[PDB]
Scaffold this motif. Structure first.
Motif: not given
Lengths: 48, 62
Positions: A30-37
């Motif tokens: 199960k994947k999950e989204v990274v928030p980006l710097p």
């Protein structure tokens, strides 16, 4: 004329089918989204 | 982290990557300023004009 109507599923609900280990072994993780710097990335610009 | 970002192996056709570059997943596994400095040219024992608040037009020594 009438005859007694069939269902499409055999079961009432889905959740028994998905949670079984027959299904679960084949699934990917199960994947999950990274928030980006929002920002000096590079290690040595001062050579330039 | 921005590690675990990996390119998708699909070639679905709904979405097409034109050059060698491939569509990027951008996913991770489920498991889980300023200095505000003291101002130069204000030494110990400079004569100074006070222009704010309670004292105005009154000189003072730091």
């Amino acid at each position: 004329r009438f005859s007694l109507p069939r269902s499409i599923m055999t079961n009432a609900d889905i959740e028994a089918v998905i949670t079984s280990d027959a299904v679960q072994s084949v699934l990917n993780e199960k994947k999950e989204v990274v928030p980006l710097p929002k920002c000096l990335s590079v290690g040595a610009c001062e050579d330039w | 982290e921005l590690l675990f970002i990996s390119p998708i192996a699909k070639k679905d056709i709904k979405r097409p990557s034109w050059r060698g570059i491939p569509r990027i997943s951008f996913t991770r596994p489920a498991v889980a300023a300023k200095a505000v400095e003291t101002r130069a040219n204000l030494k110990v024992g400079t004569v100074v004009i006070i222009v704010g608040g309670e004292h105005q037009g009154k000189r003072a020594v730091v």
